[PDB]
Amino acid sequence: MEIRGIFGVKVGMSQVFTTNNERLPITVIYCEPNQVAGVKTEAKDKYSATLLSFDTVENKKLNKPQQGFFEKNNLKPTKHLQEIRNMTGFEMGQQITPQNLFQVGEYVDVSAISKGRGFTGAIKRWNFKIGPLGHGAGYPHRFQGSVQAGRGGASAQRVFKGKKMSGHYGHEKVTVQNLRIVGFDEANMLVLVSGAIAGPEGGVVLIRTAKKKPGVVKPIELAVQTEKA
């Protein structure tokens, strides 16, 4: 099972009218073509994968150890470096175009770090009912509920690990699946995709083949008409 991937950033949100006569919203993701930093075959490294570099930078940054590492392999000076599992069918330092990997109808998946929300209450995080406000709203009415289930030295006597509670929510690389690719901009090296993409503007996203299916293209056609008078 080979999975082809690419790295990009969410640069905008848009919409379009397509065939079947229905309007669809489109995420705009600038997908930077990448350079093969290395490969790990499943004969010596114990598993198959391909490490890529992206987010290119200048030559005065990228501290001298990593600069010398890049120069040793004649690697493009980049800020970010990530690997994609189960892909070895390429050579060292190859430029990859998403067009050769993704099509106009294939469903894909995106791992993207969500928008950071910092400290969020349990209700804002677990989406439970707010306490009643009639006949006395009570001093607290927006809180966790209750975990009181232990009475006597034999029922609970303590709280269980991993109990739902307020805290840090989001800002994690969530995987969204079955995103129908809408279009490609070869000149500007960008992609337009259906659905929604987590994270803030310019958030780092990794687009790979969906794990719900091996990847089958569908007749996605964009609809345009021209009235004139």
Binding site: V11, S14, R23, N188, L192, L222, Q225, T226, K228
Partner: protein, 115 residues
Amino acid sequence: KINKQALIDLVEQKQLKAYVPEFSAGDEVNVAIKLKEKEKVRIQNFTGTVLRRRGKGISETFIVRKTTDGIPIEKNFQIHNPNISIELKRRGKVRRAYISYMRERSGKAAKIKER
């Protein structure tokens, strides 16, 4: 290396309408809508005045209200939507770019047109 977000406007340039007629709120218009049913093609004329006109480039939306059989109906429309034809009938005047009273008023309260 820079992201101007003009690329957002660039990717959707293939979708712009040809004539893009100009108008504003308080204008009576009869929009033509293509009802394609795969067994017969029906064209419906929906008349009424403009309620608002939002921008945002490709997403210019505008609400048009009709009163048929004593039933008021308001429909939001976008020029960029294919199979939709926009025809201007008359243009009036309004001291705003948004209305709420007309969204809850009745007959004999429409706006007169100015030459």
